[PDB]
Amino acid sequence: AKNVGILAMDIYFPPTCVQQEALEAHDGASKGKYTIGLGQDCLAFCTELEDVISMSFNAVTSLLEKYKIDPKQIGRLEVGSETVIDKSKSIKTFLMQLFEKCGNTDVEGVDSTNACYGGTAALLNCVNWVESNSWDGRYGLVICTDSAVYAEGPARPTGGAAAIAMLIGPDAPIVFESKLRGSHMAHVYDFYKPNLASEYPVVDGKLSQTCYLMALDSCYKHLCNKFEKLEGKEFSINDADYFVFHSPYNKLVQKSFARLLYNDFLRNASSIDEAAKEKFTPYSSLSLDESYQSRDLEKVSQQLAKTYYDAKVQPTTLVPKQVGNMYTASLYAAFASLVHNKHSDLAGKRVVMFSYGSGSTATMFSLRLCENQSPFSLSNIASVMDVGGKLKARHEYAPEKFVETMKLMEHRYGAKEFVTSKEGILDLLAPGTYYLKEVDSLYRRFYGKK
Amino acid sequence: AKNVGILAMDIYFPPTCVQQEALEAHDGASKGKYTIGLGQDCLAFCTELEDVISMSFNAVTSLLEKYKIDPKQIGRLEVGSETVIDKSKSIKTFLMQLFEKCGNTDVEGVDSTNACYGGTAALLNCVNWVESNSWDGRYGLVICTDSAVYAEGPARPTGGAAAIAMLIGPDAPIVFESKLRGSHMAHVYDFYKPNLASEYPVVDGKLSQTCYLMALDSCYKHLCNKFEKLEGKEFSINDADYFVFHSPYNKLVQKSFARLLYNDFLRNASSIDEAAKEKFTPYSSLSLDESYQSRDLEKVSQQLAKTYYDAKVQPTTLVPKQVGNMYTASLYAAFASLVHNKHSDLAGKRVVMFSYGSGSTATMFSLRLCENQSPFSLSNIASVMDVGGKLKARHEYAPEKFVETMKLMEHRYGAKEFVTSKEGILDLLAPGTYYLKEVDSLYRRFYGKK
Numbered sequence: 069a070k071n072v073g074i075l076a077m078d079i080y081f082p083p084t085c086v087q088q089e090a091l092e093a094h095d096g097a098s099k100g101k102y103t104i105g106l107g108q109d110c111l112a113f114c115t116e117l118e119d120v121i122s123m124s125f126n127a128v129t130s131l132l133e134k135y136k137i138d139p140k141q142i143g144r145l146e147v148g149s150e151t152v153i154d155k156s157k158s159i160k161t162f163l164m165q166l167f168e169k170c171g172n173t174d175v176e177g178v179d180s181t182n183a184c185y186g187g188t189a190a191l192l193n194c195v196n197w198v199e200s201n202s203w204d205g206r207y208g209l210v211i212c213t214d215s216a217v218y219a220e221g222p223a224r225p226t227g228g229a230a231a232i233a234m235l236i237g238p239d240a241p242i243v244f245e246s247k248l249r250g251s252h253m254a255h256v257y258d259f260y261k262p263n264l265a266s267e268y269p270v271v272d273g274k275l276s277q278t279c280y281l282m283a284l285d286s287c288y289k290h291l292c293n294k295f296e297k298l299e300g301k302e303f304s305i306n307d308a309d310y311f312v313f314h315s316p317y318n319k320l321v322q323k324s325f326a327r328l329l330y331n332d333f334l335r336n337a338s339s340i341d342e343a344a345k346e347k348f349t350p351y352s353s354l355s356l357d358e359s360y361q362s363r364d365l366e367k368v369s370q371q372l373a374k375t376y377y378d379a380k381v382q383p384t385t386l387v388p389k390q391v392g393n394m395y396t397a398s399l400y401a402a403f404a405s406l407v408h409n410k411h412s413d414l415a416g417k418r419v420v421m422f423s424y425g426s427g428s429t430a431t432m433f434s435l436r437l438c439e440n441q442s443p444f445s446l447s448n449i450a451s452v453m454d455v456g457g458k459l460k461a462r463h464e465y466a467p468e469k470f471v472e473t474m475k476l477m478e479h480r481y482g483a484k485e486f487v488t489s490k491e492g493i494l495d496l497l498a499p500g501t502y503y504l505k506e507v508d509s510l511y512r513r514f515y516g517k518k
Numbered sequence: 519a520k521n522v523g524i525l526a527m528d529i530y531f532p533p534t535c536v537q538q539e540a541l542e543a544h545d546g547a548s549k550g551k552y553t554i555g556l557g558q559d560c561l562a563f564c565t566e567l568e569d570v571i572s573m574s575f576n577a578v579t580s581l582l583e584k585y586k587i588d589p590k591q592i593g594r595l596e597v598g599s600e601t602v603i604d605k606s607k608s609i610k611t612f613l614m615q616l617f618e619k620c621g622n623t624d625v626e627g628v629d630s631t632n633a634c635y636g637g638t639a640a641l642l643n644c645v646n647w648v649e650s651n652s653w654d655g656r657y658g659l660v661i662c663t664d665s666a667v668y669a670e671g672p673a674r675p676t677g678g679a680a681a682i683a684m685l686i687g688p689d690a691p692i693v694f695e696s697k698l699r700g701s702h703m704a705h706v707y708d709f710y711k712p713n714l715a716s717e718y719p720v721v722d723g724k725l726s727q728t729c730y731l732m733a734l735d736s737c738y739k740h741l742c743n744k745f746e747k748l749e750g751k752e753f754s755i756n757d758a759d760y761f762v763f764h765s766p767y768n769k770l771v772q773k774s775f776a777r778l779l780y781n782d783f784l785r786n787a788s789s790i791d792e793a794a795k796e797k798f799t800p801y802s803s804l805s806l807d808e809s810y811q812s813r814d815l816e817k818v819s820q821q822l823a824k825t826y827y828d829a830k831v832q833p834t835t836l837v838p839k840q841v842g843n844m845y846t847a848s849l850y851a852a853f854a855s856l857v858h859n860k861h862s863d864l865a866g867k868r869v870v871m872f873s874y875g876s877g878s879t880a881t882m883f884s885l886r887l888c889e890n891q892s893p894f895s896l897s898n899i900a901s902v903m904d905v906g907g908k909l910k911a912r913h914e915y916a917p918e919k920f921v922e923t924m925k926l927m928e929h930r931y932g933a934k935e936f937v938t939s940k941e942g943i944l945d946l947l948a949p950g951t952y953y954l955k956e957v958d959s960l961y962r963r964f965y966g967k968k
């Protein structure tokens with residue numbers, strides 16, 4: 069099975085959102101804090117009609133239709149998420165609804181979890197399945213779905229919500245460079261959900277950044293070690309056209325690439341010139357526990373990194389910045405907007421992907437995109453995904469009406485025996501969206517279309 | 519990568535248990551109900567010192583040691599479970615504790631969930647990984663871990679609890695027959711956990727059996743279809759030496775094999791002789807919704823099946839029957855006791871495995887066991903696992919002291935900021951068991967050894 073990777077792709081996010089500027093005011097934050105501080109524009113959220121299942125039906129239904137895939141042609145379907153509706157019954161069984169008709173029940177895969185990382189877990193699982201002795205010739209399908217949703221304090225501005233669907237197969241326009249990757253996994257308490265009854269994480273936002281970069285440095289090192297063996301050269305930031313990142317908010321996207329850049333210094337690689345070596349040089353004598361904790365250094369990193377970041381990272385940022393944290397689908401929404409923006413420069417280019425999940429589980433990995441044939445083309449994908457279309461059909465909510473909706477979702481999380489209030493909302497959704505109709509007294513869930 | 523499957527194996531279950539006969543009395547059930555009705559002998563349970571993490575450290579630690587595996591040699595580690603302690607932070611990160619020292623952080627995999635099925639999900643994931651272009655030459659390690667635990671009514675007698683660890687690699691004494699398998703997945707509400715705050719499932723025990731067999735008939739059909747292509751013959755119960763099953767209680771183990779037998783009739787295969795065709799014959803005119811719902815038919819099925827079941831299924835039953843439902847580790851505990859019992863007849867034999875998970879996700883799949891070389895031998899495995907040893911070092915609890923412990927675990931499930939009460943318990947565990955020391959106010963968990 070040759071050149072396996074992603075053949076086709078679709079996305080779905082709720083059209084309902086709150087402008088970040090409008091919110092800053094609501095919260096009594098300052099002029100800059102969300103639009104400059106977090107570097108976010110607009111935050112999308114599930115109201116009472118939407119959840120990780122419905123978002124899922126949306127992105128799956130939309131992919132099969134638009135790339136014209138026969139649902140008989142699917143032989144593995146996995147889901148990555150961290151939003152839990154049931155502790156035992158996976159989202160992947162809910163989705164089996166759509167194959168209940170095509171008569172196609174012989175489909176491997178369940179859900180993969182660990183925090184922003186499950187989607188990646190699944191992706192790899194599907195690639196590996198296509199490449200294995202048990203591959204039956206049919207497609208893989210991976211769904212990354214999540215609703216990111218936080219309690220009052222300073223983490224609420226970073227929610228977001230979306231599903232992504234990826235079809236996996238041989239002869240892909242987006243080809244995995246199988247051996248060029250680095251993971252880092254560890255036992256760690258930076259962000260987690262111990263509180264079974266609430267949607268809300270316990271987040272230690274200091275640790276939450278120090279561990280993200282701890283993991284990014286180790287992934288990058290492990291990827292560099294592989295690259296030496298493969299290609300005979302030391303890896304620099306110069307060796308990839310684009311870096312794509314898990315994007316919980318744009319600020320941290322910028323510090324991440326700028327950290328790659330700093331890693332290059334430490335290794336004294338190709339992309340570090342003489343002027344940089346001096347700028348960086350005062351910081352040589354710091355411990356790592358110092359390199360992570362140190363603001364002067366972030367400051368200096370970003371400045372050297374500025375112009376490269378504009379070349380290599382900037383075009384991955386459209387969707388995250390206009391939607392918010394999409395947890396497992398974040399990376400792949402960043403990758404999507406990259407395809408939206410530079411689908412024409414892309415043939416022959418190398419995309420480096422960094423997946424992070426708190427707790428922690430992480431993997432950087434590499435893709436070679438290429439000249440391929442529709443339906444499964446860089447152009448057809450960008451076209452099919454209609455990211456400009458979708459951004460255009462959004463519906464704003466005054467911060468108020470959003471705070472309200474938040475309090476409502478909090479009452480619905482975990483609960484039973486409520487029909488959902490339709491009016492003012494149903495007609496905000498595109499004809500053919502799936503939506504929650506009710507939850508019976510046995511917590512069973514019912515969806516309608518349209 | 520040749521002949522990939524399971525190279526080595528270990529198990530762990532809590533030594534603490536309640537005799538099923540002793541319990542029947544407690545509950546005011548009748549003479550037969552648990553020992554004959556469910557066909558269970560003895561039920562193992564986690565007390566306050568044990569959980570799915572500690573059980574996990576136990577089976578992992580024990581495997582690495584006893585098969586003498588260097589923890590640097592592990593390159594993928596996945597966990598299958600359905601017991602949730604944290605909604606986002608996977609058990610697989612807790613286990614990363616043990617590689618925090620060997621310095622080995624570059625390990626793929628997270629948790630797979632769907633009900634009794636996650637372990638199988640993981641197993642396949644690891645096989646597929648060894649077989650993929652991204653395989654780095656190191657071992658797979660799969661952990662199946664669960665604590666099965668039910669509220670008062672007639673499902674409490676069917677709890678159980680255990681971890682299993684399986685090392686995955688080429689040149690295995692237990693070889694996957696890659697193409698000989700059948701899955702069945704569906705959206706269904708037979709058993710699930712909607713109640714985020716309780717350990718207890720919502721179970722619809724009628725549906726729970728009708729769906730199990732619905733899935734078993736479809737898996738078996740899909741496996742038969744494959745076998746025709748492969749070997750040129752129609753599959754009968756005669757075509758495998760042993761059938762191994764998810765074993766939530768032995769009764770349903772017997773109806774499962776006997777159903778395979780009935781499936782053979784329907785297909786009119788090799789293993790159905792003339793006398794059987796008549797016995798079966800009144801039931802020809804039933805709908806499936808009749809074949810599932812019909813007691814006369816179970817009755818007739820088991821009777822034909824009796825002697826074969828004693829040959830092909832009976833020796834897989836030791837551990838399940840003396841431990842109880844082990845959820846994702848159940849199948850593999852049944853497989854383990856099969857290796858314990860018939861490790862000498864096993865070279866050259868075919869084992870057929872049926873994995874089920876409610877909600878529902880299911881897969882039958884096949885193994886060819888073989889003549890191999892220690893450490894990774896059928897004899898060394900049976901030896902290492904010491905199933906007779908372990909059954910001997912169990913500690914009984916009067917039904918009382920068990921009901922008490924249950925009420926205690928209910929208070930601890932989901933909670934924070936309690937040190938665990940040691941005395942009367944610590945000394946019941948084998949020197950070197952991991953155990954919960956405390957849970958702080960930030961729900962973080964602390965384990966000691968021994």
Ligand SMILES: *C(=O)([O-])[C][C@]([C])([O])[C]C(=O)S[C][C][N]C(=O)[C][C][N]C(=O)[C]([O])C([C])([C])[C]OP(=O)([O-])OP(=O)([O-])O[C][C]1O[C](N2[C]=NC3=C2N=[C]N=C3[N])[C]([O])[C]1OP(=O)([O-])[O-]
Binds near residue numbers: 182223315
């Ligand atoms: C996964 O596996 O599923 C889990 C995750 C969540 O997916 C894993 C991740 O991706 S981790 C990414 C990091 N964490 C999160 O996304 C967690 C959720 N969010 C938060 O905890 C908060 O939003 C954090 C802590 C990240 C930020 O909020 P604050 O507490 O407000 O931040 P603070 O530390 O005070 O600094 C904020 C930032 O903004 C700047 N700033 C403040 N005021 C400003 C301003 N900029 C411009 N104008 C104004 N008025 C401040 O200087 C700082 O930014 P810098 O860029 O460092 O200068």
Ligand SMILES: *C(=O)([O-])[C][C@]([C])([O])[C]C(=O)S[C][C][N]C(=O)[C][C][N]C(=O)[C]([O])C([C])([C])[C]OP(=O)([O-])OP(=O)([O-])O[C][C]1O[C](N2[C]=NC3=C2N=[C]N=C3[N])[C]([O])[C]1OP(=O)([O-])[O-]
Binds near residue numbers: 556724770845846876
């Ligand atoms: C996974 O994905 O993680 C989820 C699972 C749980 O792993 C998926 C499964 O493996 S499903 C397997 C089936 N379900 C379960 O394990 C769920 C938990 N248990 C239960 O729901 C109950 O224990 C059930 C319903 C299975 C049985 O309990 P009862 O309600 O007591 O059963 P009932 O329907 O009344 O019939 C019981 C059985 O026992 C016989 N019997 C009754 N009294 C007897 C007696 N036999 C002998 N002596 C006495 N006194 C009765 O006739 C029947 O047995 P038969 O063999 O049919 O005759």
